[PDB]
Symmetry: C3
Subunit: 168 residues, 3 copies
Amino acid sequence: AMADLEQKVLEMEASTYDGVFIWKISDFARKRQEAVAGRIPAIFSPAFYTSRYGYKMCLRIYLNGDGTGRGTHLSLFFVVMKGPNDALLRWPFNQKVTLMLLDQNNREHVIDAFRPDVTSSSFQRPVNDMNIASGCPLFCPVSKMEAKNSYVRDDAIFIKAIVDLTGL
Amino acid sequence: AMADLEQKVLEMEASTYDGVFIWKISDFARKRQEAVAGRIPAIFSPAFYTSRYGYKMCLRIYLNGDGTGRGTHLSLFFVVMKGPNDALLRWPFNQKVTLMLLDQNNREHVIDAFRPDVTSSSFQRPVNDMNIASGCPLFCPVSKMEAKNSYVRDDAIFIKAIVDLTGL
Amino acid sequence: AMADLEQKVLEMEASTYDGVFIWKISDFARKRQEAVAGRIPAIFSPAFYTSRYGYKMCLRIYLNGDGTGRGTHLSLFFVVMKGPNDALLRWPFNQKVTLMLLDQNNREHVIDAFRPDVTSSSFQRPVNDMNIASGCPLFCPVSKMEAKNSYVRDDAIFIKAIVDLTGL
């Protein structure tokens, strides 16, 4: 109860309703090692929405990679979740998604973007809490970021997601 | 206090600040029977506002009717509540209000609208937590909705309120 | 924990993210006297932001004055706080700030505005929870408001802050 209430509070505190989400990941070094050790391979971000009563979404990241990026890259994925208002939304989900690793020197951000494969189960109306994630297995080489550079600063990185709202 | 905190959280989670409110009512059948049985004739929706510091409002619904619609219609009412910034607002409340029962096939929503009766106590600056509710006693026949149709889907209905912001 | 969670909830409830904040100060008479008695010289307002992930700011008011306004004026100051996303923001803080004491008769509001002194310690990237406050020592004579007039009504006053978003 108490713990479950704190959770709702944190989720409410991180949520946004305009399709733009910024995820600050503090304690980067520790989490990065917990991933390398396979103790905590992935981390989910809090949920965010395309509009006040729009699609519910979240991100999933592997600090030491997944799939073709395992052990060599930071893998970042987008997840369509079951939203409270899904019955009012058009399905399958078909909004362009842009994902970024922010350069804290704003000189060169890592960026990738994709248009949902309407035939994939990842974008159908959610039956479970979350649909199968999809995104960027090779989002960023562990060396480009992590190592040093300008992506990690004061032991934290910022991930940014932009869900295009065309048609909504 | 714990229970009181949960309530505030849930209210904050539902609040909107642009005059548009979508109220999803799950467990329709059960609440519908609680209404027919006379155990819980009415339900208040969480509060929403015309602006970040505007009028505070909520909805009141009778799943089995009230007044001229008792036992035959779904009665939907609008409620002007005592807001924390009422001293900065113009009174009496004078914004056009639109109420809707959403068709979950978007085939044809039930809609009605009204201009507040400036001389009614329902729209004067609140002295109590809530002014006397007013709205639509004959909003929707129990048969048009409930029965089946496209308003009730997966045992839930969606009510939508839109407060016109002209002059604010 | 319990009180900690309530505090978090109260903060979230008061925050805004568009650079506009309205601060309602109730129990004016009592707090006014506590300031006069030197028991509680100043009060801080809840935090608000320039954007969803922008600068974090709050206000600091002296109901019985501070500095050149001590004992004769209401002193109102602006505070740049350490925000969770300062790494992503440009420093020093350089947005125009407008502060107002609202006339609850909307006939004559007290207003002042300033463009940050970029060389000031008050606008550099925060090292501590709060930077040195800056603002209006002689914002409003204790007599103009307090005494009576239209600023204090039903034992409450409203302070409003508007942070210009040009460049953000």
